[PDB]
Design a binder for this molecule. Sequence first.
Ligand code: NA
Length: 553
Amino acid sequence: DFHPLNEAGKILIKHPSLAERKDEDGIHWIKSQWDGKWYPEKFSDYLRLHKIVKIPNNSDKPELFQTYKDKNNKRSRYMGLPNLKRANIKTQWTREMVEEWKKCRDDIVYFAETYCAITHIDYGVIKVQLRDYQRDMLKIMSSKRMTVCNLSRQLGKTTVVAIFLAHFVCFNKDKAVGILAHKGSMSAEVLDRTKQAIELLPDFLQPGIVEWNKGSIELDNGSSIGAYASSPDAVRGNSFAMIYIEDCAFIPNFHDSWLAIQPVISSGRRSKIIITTTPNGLNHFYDIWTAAVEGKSGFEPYTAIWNSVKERLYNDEDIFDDGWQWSIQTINGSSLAQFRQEHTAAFEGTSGTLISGMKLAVMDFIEVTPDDHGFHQFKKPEPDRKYIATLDCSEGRGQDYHALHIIDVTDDVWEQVGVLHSNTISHLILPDIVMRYLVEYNECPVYIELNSTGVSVAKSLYMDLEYEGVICDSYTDLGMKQTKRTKAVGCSTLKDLIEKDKLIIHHRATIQEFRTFSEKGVSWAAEEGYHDDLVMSLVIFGWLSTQSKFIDY
Ligand code: NA
């Protein structure tokens, strides 16, 4: 029957068959369902697209600063170690060098792809081959002050975490870094890798080394990296410019250590903080991730799981299968319970759904016969009652649906009184159709999602049909402008509204879409083969609900 992962009726992985194809540059490509990128059919073709680059051995030519290391001059070497340079050596800055240094300074991906190395036994010093997830993480950790990663296990995260920590200390002066982990030996392992990165850097990017031991390093610029077992002592006692928290979810009695962290980041001496971990049930981390993902804590959420290692997407026969058999083989020889625990970064005591099943079980519906159009009337319009309409237009039409909700806003408890749901109505005749329902419900104001179709619909209502009740956040944008944050907090507010019983949903298909509107880290969406149009239209309302003008349309 099912692919192990697809245990219930729900599809968590699509077969290679259903994947989009493409023939280009003499090779057969297959689109991956995890990132929507094109991957060659043959594994051998993937390798000649991600081939190894040797960083050549340079003690000879100081002119070639990109690779130059003064390894043979022992006086220049820190403690006679070839890879490390003595503290306080004056570098001879040429104009080229300054530009390249500065380039690395504010382009972390370039620095990571050009200068970070691993020393291979067969090919010598080679460039680290970054992965798309790692690249994404570098950008985020760099551009944002506070970042939190919900990763799976056996992703080589440390490789990227090391590169970043290296980049920080090598291109910032007088900056103290503290790595915090459950055990101090864990955080010692992290900086070991950071040191493995630092020691392979060319002279011009390598600051001189003052201290260089297991639990601590210090550079001649003033920057340091300290390995610590997580404690409230470590945070208060030190003045950190950056705090990296390793395996955060698996740190017992973290609440006090976390409270010690607050003043260090939150208004605030204002320092960077990077958290990376696999999840561990509904503990303190679930609260961190949720606050980040709902856009409440200023943290930038990021997530990556097994499929980010693209080697797994090619089977034993070296043909692209989008991780179909690797996943089967990894499920076997172990357990589904363990695969979720090891490879999926899912939280234990919960499903993905935005709305808790605890709430989705209590939710009753009102069965009604819809119009010629897609309109479901739950409660008739009443004179002197305030209504609010939200519209998520298709694009689209199956693909997906047009979704209009009408919400009775009069009382303290808001009620969904009408829903238009259609994949048959053209967006050219929709404005009129929608209007008669808006006009039926006491000249109901409407907040339209400004997608390609929405913008158009907004025009027709406000201008062509001269409807004076269309809500706009600006004069260029006649509806809800789509942003990452609007969706995030719209979902967050929708969750609250629904669960605290401020918003009452009557439409069965709406409640049913909530049933499969779940985690699509770092956001929420509909899972395979489901629609989210009805939910997404209510997200619009959620976001509108937070707006001051709404506090009484
Ligand atoms: Na308005």
